[PDB]
Each structure stands twice: as structure tokens, then as C-alpha cells.
Scaffold this motif. Sequence first.
Motif, PDB file in Angstrom:
ATOM      1  N   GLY A   9       0.910  -1.185   0.069  1.00  0.00           N
ATOM      2  CA  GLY A   9      -0.133  -0.149  -0.076  1.00  0.00           C
ATOM      3  C   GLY A   9       0.939   1.339  -0.008  1.00  0.00           C
ATOM      4  N   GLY A  10       1.959   1.194   0.022  1.00  0.00           N
ATOM      5  CA  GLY A  10       3.109   2.347   0.014  1.00  0.00           C
ATOM      6  C   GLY A  10       3.391   2.782   1.409  1.00  0.00           C
ATOM      7  N   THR A  11       4.636   3.394   1.549  1.00  0.00           N
ATOM      8  CA  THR A  11       5.267   3.877   2.521  1.00  0.00           C
ATOM      9  C   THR A  11       4.487   4.850   3.315  1.00  0.00           C
ATOM     10  OG1 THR A  11       7.578   3.038   1.857  1.00  0.00           O
ATOM     11  CG2 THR A  11       7.642   4.841   3.632  1.00  0.00           C
ATOM     12  N   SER A  12       3.794   5.678   2.869  1.00  0.00           N
ATOM     13  CA  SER A  12       3.083   6.619   3.222  1.00  0.00           C
ATOM     14  C   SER A  12       1.878   6.233   3.912  1.00  0.00           C
ATOM     15  CB  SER A  12       2.437   7.542   2.056  1.00  0.00           C
ATOM     16  OG  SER A  12       3.105   8.443   1.580  1.00  0.00           O
ATOM     17  N   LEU A  13       1.647   4.729   4.260  1.00  0.00           N
ATOM     18  CA  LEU A  13       0.732   4.244   5.299  1.00  0.00           C
ATOM     19  C   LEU A  13       1.263   4.356   6.476  1.00  0.00           C
ATOM     20  CD1 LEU A  13      -0.556   0.876   3.729  1.00  0.00           C
ATOM     21  CD2 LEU A  13      -1.670   3.036   3.844  1.00  0.00           C
ATOM     22  N   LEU A  14       2.822   4.497   6.630  1.00  0.00           N
ATOM     23  CA  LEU A  14       3.453   4.729   7.857  1.00  0.00           C
ATOM     24  C   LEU A  14       3.117   6.119   8.402  1.00  0.00           C
ATOM     25  CD1 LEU A  14       5.457   3.987  10.375  1.00  0.00           C
ATOM     26  CD2 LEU A  14       7.275   4.272   8.737  1.00  0.00           C
ATOM     27  N   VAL A  15       3.362   7.264   7.476  1.00  0.00           N
ATOM     28  CA  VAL A  15       3.111   8.461   7.702  1.00  0.00           C
ATOM     29  C   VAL A  15       1.631   8.737   8.291  1.00  0.00           C
ATOM     30  CG1 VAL A  15       2.821  10.618   6.939  1.00  0.00           C
ATOM     31  CG2 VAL A  15       4.924   9.365   6.071  1.00  0.00           C
ATOM     32  N   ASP A  16       0.823   7.950   7.514  1.00  0.00           N
ATOM     33  CA  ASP A  16      -0.616   8.256   8.089  1.00  0.00           C
ATOM     34  C   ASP A  16      -0.864   7.767   9.494  1.00  0.00           C
ATOM     35  OD1 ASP A  16      -1.501   8.819   5.459  1.00  0.00           O
ATOM     36  OD2 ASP A  16      -2.178   7.045   4.694  1.00  0.00           O
ATOM     37  N   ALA A  17      -0.277   6.544   9.875  1.00  0.00           N
ATOM     38  CA  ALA A  17      -0.399   5.958  11.228  1.00  0.00           C
ATOM     39  C   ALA A  17       0.381   6.693  12.151  1.00  0.00           C
ATOM     40  CB  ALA A  17       0.302   4.604  11.011  1.00  0.00           C
ATOM     41  N   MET A  18       1.506   7.364  11.854  1.00  0.00           N
ATOM     42  CA  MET A  18       2.086   8.169  12.674  1.00  0.00           C
ATOM     43  C   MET A  18       1.290   9.602  12.846  1.00  0.00           C
ATOM     44  SD  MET A  18       6.021   7.674  11.738  1.00  0.00           S
ATOM     45  CE  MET A  18       6.761   8.303  13.292  1.00  0.00           C
ATOM     46  N   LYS A  19       0.822  10.114  11.990  1.00  0.00           N
ATOM     47  CA  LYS A  19      -0.021  11.201  12.051  1.00  0.00           C
ATOM     48  C   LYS A  19      -1.310  10.828  12.860  1.00  0.00           C
ATOM     49  CE  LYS A  19      -1.352  13.334   8.309  1.00  0.00           C
ATOM     50  NZ  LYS A  19      -1.696  13.390   6.909  1.00  0.00           N
ATOM     51  N   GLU A  20      -1.789   9.879  12.979  1.00  0.00           N
ATOM     52  CA  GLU A  20      -3.134   9.740  13.715  1.00  0.00           C
ATOM     53  C   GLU A  20      -2.820   9.612  15.042  1.00  0.00           C
ATOM     54  OE1 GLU A  20      -4.074   9.789   9.758  1.00  0.00           O
ATOM     55  OE2 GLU A  20      -4.727  10.847  11.665  1.00  0.00           O
ATOM     56  N   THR A  21      -1.710   9.344  15.599  1.00  0.00           N
ATOM     57  CA  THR A  21      -1.362   9.102  17.143  1.00  0.00           C
ATOM     58  C   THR A  21      -1.203  10.711  17.682  1.00  0.00           C
ATOM     59  OG1 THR A  21       0.589   8.563  16.873  1.00  0.00           O
ATOM     60  CG2 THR A  21      -0.943   6.788  16.912  1.00  0.00           C
ATOM     61  N   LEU A  22      -0.758  11.684  16.849  1.00  0.00           N
ATOM     62  CA  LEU A  22      -0.176  12.972  17.163  1.00  0.00           C
ATOM     63  C   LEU A  22      -1.124  13.500  18.326  1.00  0.00           C
ATOM     64  CD1 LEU A  22       1.119  14.475  14.111  1.00  0.00           C
ATOM     65  CD2 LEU A  22       2.623  13.459  16.012  1.00  0.00           C
ATOM     66  N   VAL A  23      -0.909  14.032  19.645  1.00  0.00           N
ATOM     67  CA  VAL A  23      -1.570  14.634  20.395  1.00  0.00           C
ATOM     68  C   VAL A  23      -1.630  16.096  19.862  1.00  0.00           C
ATOM     69  CG1 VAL A  23      -1.466  15.904  22.791  1.00  0.00           C
ATOM     70  CG2 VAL A  23      -1.055  13.326  22.338  1.00  0.00           C
ATOM     71  N   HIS A  24      -0.548  16.615  19.185  1.00  0.00           N
ATOM     72  CA  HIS A  24      -0.433  18.051  18.609  1.00  0.00           C
ATOM     73  C   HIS A  24      -0.273  17.736  17.010  1.00  0.00           C
ATOM     74  CE1 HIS A  24       0.422  22.402  18.217  1.00  0.00           C
ATOM     75  NE2 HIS A  24      -0.742  22.292  17.695  1.00  0.00           N
ATOM     76  N   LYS A  25      -1.395  18.159  16.508  1.00  0.00           N
ATOM     77  CA  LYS A  25      -1.356  17.865  14.640  1.00  0.00           C
ATOM     78  C   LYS A  25      -0.410  18.726  14.181  1.00  0.00           C
ATOM     79  CE  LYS A  25      -4.170  14.574  15.406  1.00  0.00           C
ATOM     80  NZ  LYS A  25      -3.928  13.143  15.334  1.00  0.00           N
ATOM     81  N   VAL A  26       0.302  18.053  12.916  1.00  0.00           N
ATOM     82  CA  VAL A  26       1.214  18.886  12.109  1.00  0.00           C
ATOM     83  C   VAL A  26       0.748  20.222  11.813  1.00  0.00           C
ATOM     84  CG1 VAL A  26       2.531  18.987   9.970  1.00  0.00           C
ATOM     85  CG2 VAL A  26       2.389  16.870  11.557  1.00  0.00           C
ATOM     86  N   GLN A  27       1.065  21.315  11.727  1.00  0.00           N
ATOM     87  CA  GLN A  27       0.779  22.581  11.373  1.00  0.00           C
ATOM     88  C   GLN A  27       1.555  22.985   9.878  1.00  0.00           C
ATOM     89  OE1 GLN A  27       0.712  26.149  13.979  1.00  0.00           O
ATOM     90  NE2 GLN A  27       1.419  24.443  15.470  1.00  0.00           N
ATOM     91  N   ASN A  28       0.965  22.539   8.780  1.00  0.00           N
ATOM     92  CA  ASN A  28       1.539  22.600   7.523  1.00  0.00           C
ATOM     93  C   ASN A  28       1.678  24.028   7.091  1.00  0.00           C
ATOM     94  OD1 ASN A  28      -0.021  19.585   7.649  1.00  0.00           O
ATOM     95  ND2 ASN A  28       2.027  19.594   6.395  1.00  0.00           N
ATOM     96  N   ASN A  29       2.260  24.008   5.854  1.00  0.00           N
ATOM     97  CA  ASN A  29       2.608  25.455   5.304  1.00  0.00           C
ATOM     98  C   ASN A  29       3.125  26.287   6.135  1.00  0.00           C
ATOM     99  OD1 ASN A  29       1.250  24.708   2.843  1.00  0.00           O
ATOM    100  ND2 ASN A  29      -0.503  24.616   4.046  1.00  0.00           N
ATOM    101  N   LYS A  30       4.079  26.095   7.345  1.00  0.00           N
ATOM    102  CA  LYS A  30       4.625  26.923   8.252  1.00  0.00           C
ATOM    103  C   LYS A  30       6.154  26.724   7.781  1.00  0.00           C
ATOM    104  CE  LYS A  30       1.365  28.436  10.822  1.00  0.00           C
ATOM    105  NZ  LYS A  30       0.297  28.069  10.077  1.00  0.00           N
ATOM    106  N   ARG A  31       6.687  27.485   7.010  1.00  0.00           N
ATOM    107  CA  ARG A  31       8.367  27.385   6.652  1.00  0.00           C
ATOM    108  C   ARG A  31       9.260  28.064   7.623  1.00  0.00           C
ATOM    109  NH1 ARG A  31      11.278  30.303   3.696  1.00  0.00           N
ATOM    110  NH2 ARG A  31       9.391  30.992   2.292  1.00  0.00           N
TER     111      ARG A  31
END
Lengths: 505, 505
Positions: B226-248
Motif C-alpha cells: 500500500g506504500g510507505t506513506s501508510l506509515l506517515v498516516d499511522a504516525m499522524k493519527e496518534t499525534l497529540v498535537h497535529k502537524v501545522q503545514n505550510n509553516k516554513r
Amino acid sequence: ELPPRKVCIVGAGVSGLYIAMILDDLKIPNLTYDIFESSSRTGGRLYTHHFTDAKHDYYDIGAMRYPDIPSMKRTFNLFKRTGMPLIKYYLDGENTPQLYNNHFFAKGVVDPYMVSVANGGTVPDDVVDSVGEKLQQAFGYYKEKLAEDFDKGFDELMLVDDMTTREYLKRGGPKGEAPKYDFFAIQWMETQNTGTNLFDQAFSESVIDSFDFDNPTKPEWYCIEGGTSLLVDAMKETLVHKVQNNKRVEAISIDLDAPDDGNMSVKIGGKDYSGYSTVFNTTALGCLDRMDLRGLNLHPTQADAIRCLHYDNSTKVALKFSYPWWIKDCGITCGGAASTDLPLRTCVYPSYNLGDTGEAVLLASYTWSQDATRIGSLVKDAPPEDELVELILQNLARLHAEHMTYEKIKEAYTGVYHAYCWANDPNVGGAFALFGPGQFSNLYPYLMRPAAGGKFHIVGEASSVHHAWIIGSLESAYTAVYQFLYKYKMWDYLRLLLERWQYGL
Amino acid sequence: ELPPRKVCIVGAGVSGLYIAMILDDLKIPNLTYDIFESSSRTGGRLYTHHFTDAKHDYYDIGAMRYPDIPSMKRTFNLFKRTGMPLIKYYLDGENTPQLYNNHFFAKGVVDPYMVSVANGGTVPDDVVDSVGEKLQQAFGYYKEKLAEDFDKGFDELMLVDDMTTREYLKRGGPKGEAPKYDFFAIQWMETQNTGTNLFDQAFSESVIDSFDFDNPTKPEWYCIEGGTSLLVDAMKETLVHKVQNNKRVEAISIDLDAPDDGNMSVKIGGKDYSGYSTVFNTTALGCLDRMDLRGLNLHPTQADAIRCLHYDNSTKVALKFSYPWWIKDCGITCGGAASTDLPLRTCVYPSYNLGDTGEAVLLASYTWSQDATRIGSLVKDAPPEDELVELILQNLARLHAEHMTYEKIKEAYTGVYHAYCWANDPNVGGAFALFGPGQFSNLYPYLMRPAAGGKFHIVGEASSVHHAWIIGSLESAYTAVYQFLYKYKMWDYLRLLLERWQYGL
Ligand SMILES: Cc1cc2nc3c(=O)[nH]c(=O)nc-3n(C[C@H](O)[C@H](O)[C@H](O)COP(=O)(O)OP(=O)(O)OC[C@H]3O[C@@H](n4cnc5c(N)ncnc54)[C@H](O)[C@@H]3O)c2cc1C
Ligand SMILES: Cc1cc2nc3c(=O)[nH]c(=O)nc-3n(C[C@H](O)[C@H](O)[C@H](O)COP(=O)(O)OP(=O)(O)OC[C@H]3O[C@@H](n4cnc5c(N)ncnc54)[C@H](O)[C@@H]3O)c2cc1C
Ligand SMILES: N[C@@H](CCCC[NH3+])C(=O)O
Ligand SMILES: N[C@@H](CCCC[NH3+])C(=O)O
């Protein structure tokens, strides 16, 4: 009379245009040529970008500066023959800042940048202020031999071509009798002499670069007022057969079973173009490697050279300002360049707009090697907050902090810029040859080997001992035409080639 | 109680998501974090491209294959913790063609590619068929030490890190007592072992690559169905504070005149984000170098490492076909890869669609170094006939000429493909670290030096001895969290870190 013959010139950069210039000048009866250029544009790495039609509102994306040294006489003869409007180029200017480790250079200060061991860095104290002297000791013997006679100097330099610059500096030359330098000393020499990592390429290329940038003759430099593309225009206008643009060659062949002179062909867009007595390929080698060359039966080591000879990267970024603040506010009144460890690496002050007081171009970043790949990752075909613009404005402010602020530089910026990364150009795939260790002495001779029974030539700057300069392209083109005339025993016209072109016409 | 503290994670690739996963698991009272990610996308170099949502209709742009060797246990523990659907990855398959000098490999035949001196090439006869054996002699001592203990093996390997692979082979190792090889021997070993020019990078990186691709334990390989990005999905779902994207992040600072724990800040889009007790930077080093780090007062050699540590390039090109012709027509029934000196260099047959008889993806080209720069010059952000597609189809036909024609491969091609050149990604600026000679032993220790009084960490695959694998990112993230807990004397949670995370959870 001579039988009808036609030859194929692949590519219309300066070496292909030069081949045609020479053939047009010789006027060999019943000889013609086709020139096929993949791009919609003619000129290749001679490429001026004009922001507008205003006189100085340009920068050169490719070639831009020319030192008047004997080994480049053929280039200057081409300029004379085409009437180029040459003006002085200031390699070194006045008042140009240099910024390393967030410190400005100052003359007669020990370790102004605070990188020496004594000041908490890792650069040996005996090297920190004496890079120029130490590199003149490493390169200088060869530079002097090259100045006596480039080709003899080169052949002598080939006896140490197996080494990288770092290896030569680390081991004390080929038998350990020169000074030996530790990693950090070498790292500082590279930082102060060239682009990031390039001391891990050939020592011989570092010697030749130093020969061209710091030549013993202390030469005058020139640039073409109006941009280097004026030369392309001039070369185009004399062509007897005009360039055929949007013609990307994808295969080159010879039919060894055919007795005819004209037994070579090329494939463009799936269609055969045949009847050629000789094919001059003038493309960068990455473009050549992508072609199907099975029809030429090249020696395997020649094919290896096409794939493996190393190319450097290069990126340019040029910005327009509402007035030349570097002249007016910073006293940077006669060109030169500012060097820094900041991402932009080198900021080049134009030599062609020194008396202008309105809009002006600045060549705010010129990079090589990994520095160019990093800036190039921000260069987009369809430009976009533009991260590259903001990086350049911030780096410019830090590099000119003795006189400017970020706010004043940003205010003067007109919002018009252009950038270009040569490794991202599909018609080159790199900036220019910059060979790795051993390549000049081992692979290059096979690159230059007769192929297809003396009817195929690999031509261009990489196919010369003068990489990354127009002179290399012109020399390579001259030699191929010599070989072509010799192959067909056109002795009158070979004698005429020597009479008229042995130094450039 | 512990006082309230906030840390900042720059970047949400696997390093940054792993820092967050560890903190979320420790549940340290009154500790929070912000994750800032420059991209609209989370995962960095874990990046699966789905052509459609159909189960196998994808390829992995970044990480894709994992050898089950002891030094990578932390990677497999992450896979287990997140429930990844692992399936076998076939590094070597059946019936995969190998094409050099327009000849296919044949077992038990001398010089099948006809590149040796005996057959008109320049490869020494005693090297042409024994690259594996001669590189196992060059690397094997160190490979065995690395297998005993990776960190002790690495420290012993650092005693020859001044050499490039080419230098080691040319000189016979550090005292001349190993076999000495001529330029063309070394050139053939490189052609048969790695990407174009990479023997001019560190010997130690060639050793470690060989250790990972030809490990003495002869490992099983895995990929994520299913692709390595399944790992990213799984890691994201446990985050207590979610990623803030478009923040360089464009700057990082510490205010040394402030007594607080929380005296660090970052700048994003001109605005300050303050109050951090520690900043973990997880970006590639080129992105870090572009930031204004003056506020951190980094040691100058640490700054040098950020600018100068070498990165390799890498490009991938994946095409869809109406049926898996390599399986059905060529007998290439269980993965593996076809290598060649043609431009595409490596054609990787997927391990995740072996049973499929409808549309199928092929990873037609996977390249490194100058090969990747050259393919990458044809990769456009807005794709276009398409020169890259035509090149890949033509190379595929030549590589599979024992069973396929160009016409059948082109007819099977559906017209859907995707390509990606990591050096052109502004959020990375390269594929991964691949250090030059001397860099691991001289610059890397300074990259890893405590900074901002122990409150700033440069984290990620380049900040590890396992470049270009997930394991390097995870080890670097674990080490930085260890240092953070130690700096604030959070002894209970440091003991818990060791208890739960010393091999990965
Ligand atoms: C950044 C930069 C700075 C430079 N600075 C200087 C300088 O200041 N002074 C100096 O003297 N020199 C300089 N040079 C070097 C000089 O520009 C080059 O050496 C020279 O222009 C190269 O000419 P060429 O004819 O060998 O190659 P090219 O200019 O590359 O010409 C080859 C032509 O072949 C075409 N082509 C490619 N593939 C195909 C195909 N399949 N079919 C048909 N056509 C094809 C290309 O589009 C191109 O037009 C610089 C170069 C660069 C990149
Ligand atoms: C072509 C390729 C193939 C690979 N193959 C494999 C493989 O098969 N197996 C394996 O184990 N590993 C493989 N790897 C390696 C693995 O993909 C990486 O080592 C790992 O994913 C890197 O993780 P990271 O968190 O260190 O860095 P990154 O993934 O680069 O994450 C850093 C993040 O920081 C973000 N960022 C950048 N600048 C800023 C900024 N200014 N502000 C905020 N955020 C910013 C970036 O967008 C990115 O999301 C491969 C890598 C590549 C390139
Ligand atoms: N001619 C180019 C490149 C010279 C360096 C080549 N390694 C210049 O003047 O910038
Ligand atoms: N992990 C990547 C890169 C390995 C080589 C790094 N120099 C792969 O499996 O292809």
C-alpha cells in the motif's frame, strides 16, 4: 570537381555555429550542411536574458566574461570578426564586501572571520590568512608551464591528474614533498577558492581554473555590451544554411555496408535524415548519451566517457532594482563581486551599467556545484511568497549590512527577477564539464577517439582542455573540421583552414 | 510538578513525527510541542504516489525497501508499533536482464559484455568478471566489523575515512598492502556497484552501502503493501498535537539574556513563535543552511558542516502499463531489478503487484548521482512528445530485447506516468546525505556538537551514521530526545525513555 557532400551539425550552440562559420568561409565546392537544434532557441550556453529592450536591462545566463590571455586568442578573434562591442569587465572591483562566519573581511587583520583555531574555529592558524599563497604554491608550477605553452603545460599536469585537489593538498603532492594539509585547512582553501565540494574533483581542473582566474599575465577582462547573445545573432546572420530549430536528434548511425561517402544518418522525431558524409555532434555529453548510438559502434571506453565524464552545476539569479543602490549607497562603483558563505555565495556587480542611475540589474547570486543545486531547487519554470526572492533579499541585506538594510533593499527591488539552473535545462543537463580525478588522463582520450571510420566527431567544450569557456568550444570545433578535411583528403581546403583559421579568423 | 515547557519540531518527516511519537508515549506532565512543516504535505521523504486509489496503483517516490538486519531493528519496531502491512521485497528476482555495452549478462562466460582488454575494451581482464569478489575484498573486513557491532565497526572504519573509494582502490588501502587498481578497473567496479561518479565520494559510504545491500547475514527484505506513506498516516493519527503545514521556518534563535527555560524562538513568514525550551530541527541540511541561524551562535565548523556535507541526488520514473508485460512476457515473475549502462540505469520490478494481471506499475528508472541529475533534467513540474517518456520506452525496449519490442512496450504503456527528482524539491534540495572523503570523520562531529547551551538539535538522516535509510532518521531523533531529557534533568522520563525506546517501541 569535388563530388557533392553534406554534413550534419548536431546543435547550434557556439561550437556548431563555429563549424558552420568555418565551412562558410572556406566555400568548399558542392559541400553543404544541415544544422539541427533541439531547442526553439539558438545559442545554447550563450544566452542573454533581456528583462526589457532597454539598453542594459539584461543579464547573461551563460557565458559573460572573457580574460584576454594568449590561450583564448581564438575567442577574441571570433569577437573581432563578428564586430562584438567589447567593454571592460571588472573581475575585482572597489569596496566589494566579503562575508564569512558573519564577519566582514578587512585587510591586514589576522583571522578577520574568526575561524582559526586560535579564535575557536578549526582552520589552522598558519592557513587562515594565507589561502592565496598556499594555493599558489600548490598550483603555481603548473600555472607557469601552462602560461609558457598551454598544451605542453597540460601534458605535464596530466602526470598528476589521478589526484583530486583535496588529495594533492592532503598528501603533499605526488611524492609527499609538498606541504601536507589537514582536512580543515583544505576545507577553508576550498571555501575561499571555489564552490562547495569542488576540491573533490580533479586537481587539474582546479589548476586550470586558477590559471584562468588568476593568470600570471594579470590580464584585462572583457564582456559584450548588450549581452553575449549579440555574438549568437552575428554568427546566425552569416549562416549560408540557417539553423533548423525544434529538431532534436535521437539517434546517429553509419551504414558500413554502403560504399558512399554519404553513408551516415540521424533520426529526429522517428524520421531518418540520411546522406551525410560526416556528423559533428556538439551537444553536452548528457544529451549525447541519451541518443541511440548503436549505429556508430563506438569503442566501449568512449561510450563510458560520454556517460561518466563529470559535469558541474551552476545557477544564476538576477534581480532588478529601481536604482543601483550598490553603486550609490555602498560605493561599489566599478563591478567586481562579493563572496560569502551565505547561500547566494557570489554576488556579481555588473560592469555594463556603471553609469546608469535608473533601473539596474544585479546578478545577485552565481553559484556552482552543491550550492547551485540548492539554489536551483528554488528555481521554477513557472515562478510563484517566493522563497528564492526572499532568500536573496535577506542574503543581500546581510552581505551589504555595512551600508544597507533589508527594508531598503526590499523597497528598491522592483519585483522583477529571473533565475536559471543549468542542470535543469533538458538541452544541456549540467552547466559544463568539470572532470573528476583521472578523467582527463584516462577517459578524455577515448572521448576524442576516431569513430565511424573517422566520420563522427564529439565536439564542444567538454571535448577540449578548456572546459567551461567559449575557447574550449571553438578549439574543439576547429579540430573536428581539420579532421573532416583530412579524412576526405581535401588538401587545398585543409591548407586554407590552417592559413586562415589556425588562430581563429 | 514539572513546570510547563514547550518544544518546537521543525519538519514533519519521519524524524519529526518520531520525536512527537516518543514524547506522546512518555506523557511528560505539562510538556507540549508544536510541529511546523513547510510543505502542504506531511511525511517528507516518505512519499507514496498513488496514480489512482486502486490497491497496487502506486509507487514509492522516497523510501520503499527495508532489509531485516540487526542495525535496523528500530525501523522494524516502528513498523510493528504502527501495524504496517509488511510483505516480502525481492531485491534479486528471477530472469532480470543486465545490459552493458549492448550485451546481456551470461553466467559462466568470460567478459560477456565485451569490455575487457582481451575483447577491445580497457577493463583489465582480471577485474572484468570479478567485481563482486574484489569489492568484497576491499569492503569485507569492515563489513564484518559493522555486523559485529555497528558503532564499533564505524569507529574503526573512520580510521580510513580520509579516502574516497577510488583512492582506496588506487593506492591499495591506507598503507599500500591491499591490491592496487588502475583507473579503468575502478571505473568498471563503480559502474557495476553504484551510480556514476559515486566512487569519488567517501570510501566509508561505499562500505556502509555494501553493508546494507549485501549484508553478511543475507537478510530478508520487506516493503509496505500500500506504500510507505501508510506509515506517515499511522504516525499522524496518534499525534497529540497535529502537524501545522505550510509553516516554513526561516530563522531559529535563543535569547541568552533571558533566564527562562522557554527562551528559544523561530520565525515563520516574518512572525516570531516564541517560548520554546528546545528546538529540534529535522530538515535536510540545505534547508537548514537557508535559515538565519545567527541567533544560535553556532560553532563555525558546525555551520561549515551544514553547508558542506555532501548530498546525493536521486530520480524516479514510474510508468503504468495495461498489463505487467515483464511478468507475463519476460518471465520476470518475482521482483528484483535490471541494471544497465543505459540512461535509466536501474529498472525495479515491483514486489507488490506480482499476482496482478490488469494495469500495473513499473518503476522503470531509479537513478542516483549524475545519472539522476541527467534524468531529472527531463522531469517537469507541469509535464508535457515527452522526451522522458520516449527515452524510458526506448531504454526499456533495449533492456528487454530478449522478449519485447519497442512497439509492444509502447502499445502497453497507458500514457500515465510520474517522475520526481529529489534535488529539485525545495523542501529537501537533494535525495539524502552521501558524504565526501573526510566528512564523517572531520565535519560530522561538529554537526552533532551541542548548540544553544544544549537546547538546539540538528536531527535527521544526515545527522546519523545511517544515511539514506529510515533507521538513520529514527536513531537521530531518539538521540536528540535523550539529550533533551538529560539537559532538563528529567531523570524519571530519561529512565523511561531507555526502558521503552532503547530498541524502538
Ligand atoms: C553558467 C555558465 C557560465 C559561463 N561563463 C562563461 C564565461 O564567462 N566565459 C566563457 O568564455 N564561457 C563561459 N561559459 C561557457 C560557455 O558558455 C560554453 O562553454 C559554450 O557556450 C558551450 O558551447 P557548445 O557549443 O560547446 O555547447 P552548447 O552551448 O551546449 O551547445 C550545444 C547545442 O546542442 C543543442 N542540443 C542538445 N541536445 C540536442 C539534440 N539531441 N539534438 C540537437 N541539438 C541538441 C543544445 O540545445 C545547444 O544549443 C559559461 C557556461 C555556463 C553554463
Ligand atoms: C529516493 C530515496 C529512496 C529511499 N529509499 C529508502 C528505502 O528504500 N528504505 C529506507 O529505509 N529509507 C530510504 N530512504 C531514506 C528515507 O526516505 C529518509 O532517510 C527519511 O525519510 C528522511 O526523514 P527525515 O525526517 O530525516 O527527513 P525529511 O523526510 O526530509 O523530513 C524533513 C521535513 O522538514 C520539512 N522542512 C524542510 N524545510 C523546512 C522548513 N524551513 N521549515 C519547516 N519544515 C521544513 C520538509 O518538507 C520535510 O517534511 C530513501 C530516500 C530517498 C530520497
Ligand atoms: N567560465 C565560467 C566557469 C569557470 C569555472 C569552471 N570550473 C566562469 O567564468 O564563471
Ligand atoms: N536507501 C536507498 C539508498 C541506498 C544508497 C545510499 N547511498 C535505497 O535503498 O536505494
